Amino acid sequence: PKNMGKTIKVYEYVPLLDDRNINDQGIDANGAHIVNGNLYGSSKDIGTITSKLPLLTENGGRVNRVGFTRLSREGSIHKFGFFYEFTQESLDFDSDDQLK
Amino acid sequence: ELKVAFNKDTYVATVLDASGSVPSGSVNVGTFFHPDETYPDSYVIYHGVRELLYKRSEVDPAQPGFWPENITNMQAVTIDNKATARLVLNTSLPRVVSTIEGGKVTLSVVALGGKAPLKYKWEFRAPNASTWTAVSGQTTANLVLDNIDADKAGEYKVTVTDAAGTSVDSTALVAVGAYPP
């Protein structure tokens, strides 16, 4: 859009289970605070999945809390352009009637 | 400073360097900065030569004049650049780069112009400080930080100076988020 500027910006939104989701809002399944904000990230190891897996109980309190993270990008537009010139005779007294 | 000298007959406004040599048949018509200080881009040598020709006379390039007798017909004048070009940084560093610990950020710059020997030097400012620390090693056009940690975040600046001393500068902020230590 015009009157906005010359650069653009967006909002990349990381998923909950991603190693880039680096946040401090995290409560482990036992209700204690944990350093990692996500659940387990992009890990594959089955041990680290069966642990930190969100498990609720009959009396569920603040025992599973996760955070989120937002990133950004940018890109600027640049001006390009060339041109050419021609005289009147070069169009009138020319073999081609379609030179233009 | 670009010294322009204009010829009466061939209509050739040779834009030599500041310490140049006005050719035969040409007369000095003025001097302007190509990297114009207040507006670096959006101004081109073609614009500098025009305003200098807007104070001359059509009858004689010397003995300056104005609008009724100035040389406004820029179509007939040929600008034969014989001076060193700007040190245009074609691709500057990304303004902000986001990475996680263990990643890798390869900062890059491409320079075109100036004298033949181009010198590349990088600099690093602490993420909260004000003085610019000097990055050891480097001396290249692409800095590669590998296994980047939370200590290496901050602002990285490169300064490309040629054999003359016309340095162009570009900065980049590297924010590497991580769990707190």
mmCIF file of C-alpha atoms in Angstrom, chain A residues 39-92:
data_model
loop_
_atom_site.group_PDB
_atom_site.id
_atom_site.type_symbol
_atom_site.label_atom_id
_atom_site.label_comp_id
_atom_site.label_asym_id
_atom_site.label_seq_id
_atom_site.Cartn_x
_atom_site.Cartn_y
_atom_site.Cartn_z
ATOM 1 C CA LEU A 39 6.297 -29.286 26.487
ATOM 2 C CA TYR A 40 9.236 -31.131 24.919
ATOM 3 C CA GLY A 41 10.080 -29.220 21.732
ATOM 4 C CA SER A 42 11.253 -30.973 18.569
ATOM 5 C CA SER A 43 12.819 -33.946 20.358
ATOM 6 C CA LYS A 44 12.122 -37.488 19.177
ATOM 7 C CA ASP A 45 13.497 -39.591 22.070
ATOM 8 C CA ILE A 46 10.578 -41.571 23.504
ATOM 9 C CA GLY A 47 11.809 -41.066 27.059
ATOM 10 C CA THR A 48 11.685 -37.284 26.751
ATOM 11 C CA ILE A 49 8.198 -37.603 25.230
ATOM 12 C CA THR A 50 6.686 -39.896 27.868
ATOM 13 C CA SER A 51 8.184 -37.464 30.342
ATOM 14 C CA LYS A 52 7.007 -33.833 30.072
ATOM 15 C CA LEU A 53 3.890 -35.242 28.355
ATOM 16 C CA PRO A 54 0.864 -33.290 29.634
ATOM 17 C CA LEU A 55 -0.847 -35.642 32.088
ATOM 18 C CA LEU A 56 -3.881 -34.462 34.040
ATOM 19 C CA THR A 57 -5.445 -35.960 37.160
ATOM 20 C CA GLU A 58 -8.925 -36.058 38.668
ATOM 21 C CA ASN A 59 -8.189 -32.860 40.620
ATOM 22 C CA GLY A 60 -6.426 -30.812 37.964
ATOM 23 C CA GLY A 61 -5.030 -27.447 38.979
ATOM 24 C CA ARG A 62 -2.337 -25.190 37.508
ATOM 25 C CA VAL A 63 -0.302 -28.279 36.679
ATOM 26 C CA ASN A 64 0.197 -27.749 32.945
ATOM 27 C CA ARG A 65 1.023 -24.327 31.494
ATOM 28 C CA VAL A 66 2.714 -23.443 28.202
ATOM 29 C CA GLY A 67 3.969 -20.291 26.509
ATOM 30 C CA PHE A 68 4.241 -19.002 22.960
ATOM 31 C CA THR A 69 6.662 -16.971 20.857
ATOM 32 C CA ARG A 70 6.337 -14.612 17.891
ATOM 33 C CA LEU A 71 9.000 -13.661 15.326
ATOM 34 C CA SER A 72 9.145 -11.281 12.362
ATOM 35 C CA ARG A 73 10.605 -10.773 8.892
ATOM 36 C CA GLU A 74 11.188 -7.846 6.553
ATOM 37 C CA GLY A 75 11.790 -6.940 2.922
ATOM 38 C CA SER A 76 12.178 -3.636 1.077
ATOM 39 C CA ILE A 77 11.185 -2.658 -2.453
ATOM 40 C CA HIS A 78 13.738 -1.162 -4.854
ATOM 41 C CA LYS A 79 13.229 1.131 -7.837
ATOM 42 C CA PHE A 80 14.161 -0.212 -11.275
ATOM 43 C CA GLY A 81 13.683 1.191 -14.759
ATOM 44 C CA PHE A 82 15.210 1.891 -18.178
ATOM 45 C CA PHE A 83 14.148 3.750 -21.315
ATOM 46 C CA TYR A 84 14.842 4.383 -24.993
ATOM 47 C CA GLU A 85 14.426 7.233 -27.462
ATOM 48 C CA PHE A 86 13.289 7.582 -31.067
ATOM 49 C CA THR A 87 12.889 10.421 -33.548
ATOM 50 C CA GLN A 88 9.873 11.154 -35.731
ATOM 51 C CA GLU A 89 11.557 10.249 -39.021
ATOM 52 C CA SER A 90 12.673 6.919 -37.542
ATOM 53 C CA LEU A 91 8.971 6.021 -37.318
ATOM 54 C CA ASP A 92 7.631 7.738 -40.449
#
